Design a binder for this molecule. Structure first.
Ligand SMILES: Cc1c(C(=O)C2=C(O)CCCC2=O)ccc2c1n(CC1CCOCC1)c(=O)n2C
Ligand SMILES: Cc1c(C(=O)C2=C(O)CCCC2=O)ccc2c1n(CC1CCOCC1)c(=O)n2C
Ligand SMILES: [Co+2]
Ligand SMILES: [Co+2]
Lengths: 382, 382
């Protein structure tokens, strides 16, 4: 059931912003590892004396990497005279964030009809304000409220090209990499207490719970009206056999924060071929693959959806497969993106639920906990 | 003239350590951009609860990338019980360094006969101590004194594999990249006042001035007995037509620090081919090339050293050429390595001064200031 209770008009995920110590090195690493093009910048060369911000794009996916300059470059500025292109940016906040959490997501940005209205309605409905609505060049409005931990939900609305003050990138510096990634499917937070986190976010958005179907977690998914903005939240389950990965996250992250970004591919086979080729030459590593018993067991579960060759391709790439009552999910997880065992990336492709494809088709793979455990002792039984 | 006045036995450059906010992303970027292999690690997976440290190697060149974890992971430790593999590491120092300077070199490490003796003699001769000698697993001794700004000169001595507590890397994660870089040729600092910086460092090392042959700088080079450890220092020259690049460095870096690392290649043509192929796909960018008049003028200057084809190869790659009374230098400069216009890399190859090749053969390229200016108006004169 979907009561379509959004308190303001929400469109799609717009961008994800990482707060970095050095935006250049993280952006270049991510560009090569994920096949994303350098498409916009705001930095010293564009007159920004406050922060360096670099935008990578792949299809509709937008990753922004931002780091602070020395405060001395802008010590004469005040907010009315700022050269920052993102007016919510604060040197102290950014340094405190990265010192506390390491490299990670500061902002989950969604595009809305009216960011000023979204901010006002959110705050009237319990949202903790983080940065008030600000109109940029009479063309774009940005506002921010707290989501969880030090992560903010950023509202962006356009009157009618990323943000004013950003410049399109050089072409020589813009190599057209593309491994098939096309959009953000969902963005997942880890918190100590799921109940109060859900109540808070659902309280100020009107997002509804997305229906599902002990591994150390309890989770729930909040969804917009058309279920294209999907914000799952996890809490740890304590006392289990193996220590909860959610608890490890909270310890190494110094509390709640964004756990994973799931990136939809239009061809997950190509994406994983291209990413795995680059794992050991600057790109991303992937978790250890399931045993061959898992891919043996795929015939009975999804043999009506994938051929033997397509299943063999999944086995070659370490891809996981789950199924809803509506659709099928192909997914795989990277190792952590940086030094800490905190944020990682999921690559996904969904098949089914054709109307366009409806959001969340096939679920989020919670069935793969049983099937992985079921595969593990099965391969031990050889 | 070389008075060979070293106050302790110095061998060669040993490693360069960058202090990072996220060591993983910088190390992976540098590995791909420079063709260096991942060869050792010290991090959570090796029992280090304090810092993540990753070592890249190319030939004898060793780049170490280090970032701090949350202090909470090690809050129960004291120095006698530390799990840090580099005992001089301090969370607060590292965070303060990166917040002040951004990504940059913390340590220039040289191998010595006896790091305890080098430390004692240095401090008795005016060196400001930074970290006292500490013996690691009864096998290696490390000590540190201040060099300039927040950069330290690190002494390392071995009784008889990088450092104890580091583990050799996985092989699957160790891709054998190699673009031809083989060793560190020199490491250059920028300071506000050259005189007092030279007096200080030469005072405690016994390093002697290396002889040379207004562009915004004055410089001088300090050298070990066999002139294989070379430590140039620059100061700005104020009031010039174009603003001094040394002054821009000092402003954006928040004071003195390491300006550039010069990396010797055994085949600078191959190195630059390989690095330029990767500039726009995660690697490093190079400064704009000199005009063709520069390569025209190369025939009269070095036509006895390089063929027309070899000169044409220099022009294809943007390589600069200078000449001493003893040797010839091929060199090129990267754009800044990170967000700030501070640290950059030089790639070099030297030809001549055969005995092995003597250190500093061909100088450091100061002649290229005249020849570049001479080339610029010449190409304007077309
Ligand atoms: C995170 C995750 C998902 C997943 O994406 C997901 C959501 O989007 C919504 C909430 C429910 C959910 O579970 C699916 C299956 C998984 C899994 N993990 C955890 C590890 C995977 C790699 O290492 C880091 C964590 C695992 O073991 N299996 C088998
Ligand atoms: C730094 C540099 C060197 C060089 O390496 C060097 C030393 O090792 C020892 C001290 C003397 C010295 O000059 C040689 C020639 C140069 C040069 N620069 C500065 C810019 C180059 C690219 O952008 C950043 C700075 C330039 O314009 N020319 C023509
Ligand atoms: Co997921
Ligand atoms: Co140099």
């Amino acid at each position: 059931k979907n009561p379509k209770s959004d308190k303001f008009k929400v469109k799609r995920f717009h961008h994800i912003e990482f707060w970095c110590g050095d935006a250049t090195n993280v952006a270049r690493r991510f560009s090569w590892g994920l096949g994303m093009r350098f498409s916009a910048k705001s930095d010293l060369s564009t007159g920004n004396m406050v922060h360096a911000s670099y935008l990578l794009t792949s299809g509709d996916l937008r990753f922004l990497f931002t780091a602070p300059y020395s405060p001395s470059l802008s010590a004469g500025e005040i907010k009315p005279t700022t050269t920052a292109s993102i007016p919510s940016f604060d040197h102290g906040s950014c340094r405190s964030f990265f010192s506390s959490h390491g490299l990670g997501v500061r902002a989950v940005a969604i595009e809305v009809e009216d960011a000023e209205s979204a901010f006002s309605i959110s705050v009237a409905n319990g949202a903790i304000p983080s940065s008030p609505p600000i109109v940029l060049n009479e063309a774009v409005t940005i506002a921010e409220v707290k989501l969880y931990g030090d992560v903010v939900l950023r509202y962006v609305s356009y009157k009618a090209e990323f943000l004013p003050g950003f410049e399109r990138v050089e072409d020589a510096s813009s190599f057209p990499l593309d491994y098939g990634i096309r959009r953000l499917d969902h963005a997942v937070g880890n918190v100590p207490e799921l109940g109060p986190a859900l109540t808070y976010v659902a309280g100020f958005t009107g997002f509804h719970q997305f229906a599902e179907f002990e591994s150390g977690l309890n989770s729930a998914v909040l969804a917009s009206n058309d279920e294209m903005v999907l914000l799952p939240i996890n809490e740890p389950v304590h006392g289990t056999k193996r220590k909860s990965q959610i608890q490890t996250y909270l310890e190494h992250n110094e509390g709640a924060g964004l756990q994973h970004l799931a990136l939809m591919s239009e061809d997950i086979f190509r994406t994983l071929r291209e990413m795995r080729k680059r794992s050991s030459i600057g790109g991303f590593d992937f978790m250890p693959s399931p045993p061959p018993t898992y891919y043996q067991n795929l015939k009975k579960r999804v043999g009506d959806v994938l051929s033997d060759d397509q299943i063999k391709e999944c086995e070659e790439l370490g891809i996981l497969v789950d199924r809803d009552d509506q659709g099928t999910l192909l997914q795989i997880f990277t190792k952590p993106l940086g030094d800490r065992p905190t944020i990682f990336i999921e690559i996904i492709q969904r098949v089914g639920c054709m109307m366009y494809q409806s959001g969340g088709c096939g679920g989020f793979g919670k069935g793969n906990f049983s099937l992985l455990f079921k595969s593990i002792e099965e391969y031990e039984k050889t």
